[PDB]
């Protein structure tokens, strides 16, 4: 299948409570593999998946040095953002950044990403050309001008097309037994009366990996989009995910409802119904 | 492996 | 500028009385990142609770999984209690072994 690598940085100021906290996590697809937290007793980039543990001390030392340098950069960026938005030094603010690379099923680069936010709103994004910028506001246009003058896009492009792809491919090979294994959902429908004339049908998907899934209810073969309660996909804690979709249906009409499940681990989409007794 | 490009705002 | 948490409380596997399992409280969709999450057993805070490393979704909202090992029984109740800047008081969501 297709695969991605993504890093997520969060920098959170806290005036009066020390320097801003910096947390970074790295993922391959829906598998976290590294973390870094500037509030740890001894901040270090640390493994979070079995297949990264084999990397040697040069890897861990180099990733730690880079994350410490990044924490310093993002502390500076929080100070700069206060200037750009005319904000006081008393408030708590957050910079977030996500970046990485996507590969298609053939292992080829599909696209790169590198986007940042300030206080949970888009700030600046590298465009898909890996060459030009989209700034969300007049503050981010200042950053854009600085980055254009310094040819930052070219440096990010070189990472995203080069080391990002090369290291993702390495991880996919070293973690192949898990990263390249889809676990299909285990599915079933439950039934719970709500009253004498309506009942909830809940279609469950459990134990699946990766997280992407489609669960839909049809009534007489028509999708019930506007009448379905669909919970957010949620982690089980064993690498797998869970989801459910529910509809409230007239009693006696349960057999007119079908649940449809699509997942990369399934050879063909599944159709399920409530099976009494 | 993380990117190392320094991106000061 | 602030987003309140969504909360789901559930188990790692379908609950079976007397069988060890994990109780999960997944908090998501929130901003800013500071959040207080306790897991409760019959109203009292469970001491041994771990959580995932802070990450966020494509809309910049944060998510965290809090979890603890537990053995459900017929009569014990469990819950997750969440506080966040967007909440005037903590929100308690009881575990429903069918949700």
Residue numbers in the entry:
A (entry chain A): 1 to 277
B (entry chain C): 1 to 9
C (entry chain B): 1 to 99
Publication excerpt:
Allopurinol, widely used in gout treatment, is the most common cause of severe cutaneous adverse drug reactions. The risk of developing such life-threatening reactions is increased particularly for HLA-B*58:01 positive individuals. Despite the known pharmacogenetic association, the precise mode of interaction between allopurinol and HLA-B*58:01 remains unknown. Taken together, this data demonstrates that allopurinol, and to a lesser extent oxypurinol, may enable the loading of unconventional peptides that are normally suboptimal in forming stable peptide-HLA-B*58:01 complexes.
To test this possibility, we selected a known peptide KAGQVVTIW that has been identified by mass spectrometry analysis of HLA Class-I peptide pools eluted from purified HLA-B*58:01 of a 721.221 cell line. The endogenously bound HLA-B*58:01 peptide is from a self-protein lamin A/C, and contains the preferred anchor residues at P2 (Ala, Tyr, Ser) and P9 (Trp, Phe). The PΩ-Trp residue of both peptides occupy their respective F-pocket of HLA-B*58:01, which is typical of canonical peptide binding behavior. The indole ring of P9-Trp also forms hydrogen bond with Asn77 on α1 helix directly, and interacts with Tyr74 on α1 helix and Ser116 on β sheet via one water molecule. The most notable difference in binding interactions between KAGQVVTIW and KAGQVVTI occur in the middle part of peptides, where the P4, P5 and P6 residues help to support the protein-peptide complex stability by means of secondary anchor bonding. The only interactions among this region are P4-Gln with Glu63, P5-Val with Arg97, and P6-Val with Lys146 mediated via three water molecules separately. The data showed the average melting temperature (Tm) is 71 °C for HLA-B*58:01-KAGQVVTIW and 65 °C for allopurinol-KAGQVVTI-HLA-B*58:01 and oxypurinol-KAGQVVTI-HLA-B*58:01.
